[PDB]
Structures are given as C-alpha cells and as structure tokens.
C-alpha cells in the first residue's frame, strides 16, 4: 500500500510529538517517493535536523528547506527541481500535505501541512498526502507561527522515517 512516514518535532528542544503522514503514491508516485526518501534519508540527505521555517496561523505550517532553512533552498532526490506531477488531489481541509513551490514545475523538498481548507492553491500546488495522526502536534506548531510566517520557537524535525 501507500507509504506511511513520520516526523518527530521539537519546539525549543521540547518534544511536541509525532506527525504521521500517508503519502498518496497511488495518485502521485513520483512526488510521494521524493518525500518518502527524504524522510528515511536513504539518498544521503533529507529532513532530519531541519526546521519548520514558515508557519502562519489559520493557514499552514511549512518545512523542508534542509539546505538554507529559510524557504530559498531544498532539493529533490531527482535533482534540484521536478515537475508538477498532477493536480488530482485537492486542498480539502486541515491535515492536507502539499508541495511548496516557486511557481509551476519547481518542486524540490519544501512542503506544507494545511491547518484550514486552502482551496485557492488547487491547481498550483501538488497535494500528495495527509495527516493520519498528530493533528495536535500540527496545531501546536501552528500556535508558534505568526502572520509574517516567522516562528516564535525553533521548530525542528528531530527524527523522521518510514513506518510502512
């Protein structure tokens, strides 16, 4: 079946708990595989030790810039960037997992977890999974964001990996 992966998240060195994500490899296999491998770190790089660098209450929590830690970086297991696979899955509600980008066909490693229905991103960002467990952790992360995106605590993915 579809991969299940996890992110364990700290805020100022205090554990918040675990976010478990289903990756919809049935719909977006290339996009799912990138995220899966970045969670395991099996290519020699990935999300472990990196941060949620942009968090906006009543919108989303963004992470995945494991090279520059500020929204300008990241890379995929395929190369620097890869195409929008499809827009079949929609931003239907809280818990949706979707690729951050800098316009069409600029997926790398950055991603966001929605805390509301972000319907205006449909057709612009590739949705590739959702939160199976740990919305409480996501809401804690959200509570440390601000309107500007700047976080009030350092939010770190201390561990990550594949469950199945």
Numbering used by the authors: 44 to 207
Authors' description from the paper:
Ten fragment hits with low-affinity dissociation constants (millimolar range) were identified. Their scaffolds and proline-mimicking motifs were used to select in cerebro a set of 52 derivative fragments for subsequent X-ray crystallographic experiments. Apo CypD crystals were soaked with each of the 52 fragments. X-ray structures of CypD complexed with 14 fragments were obtained. The half-maximal inhibitory concentrations (IC50) of the 14 fragments were >5 mM in all instances.
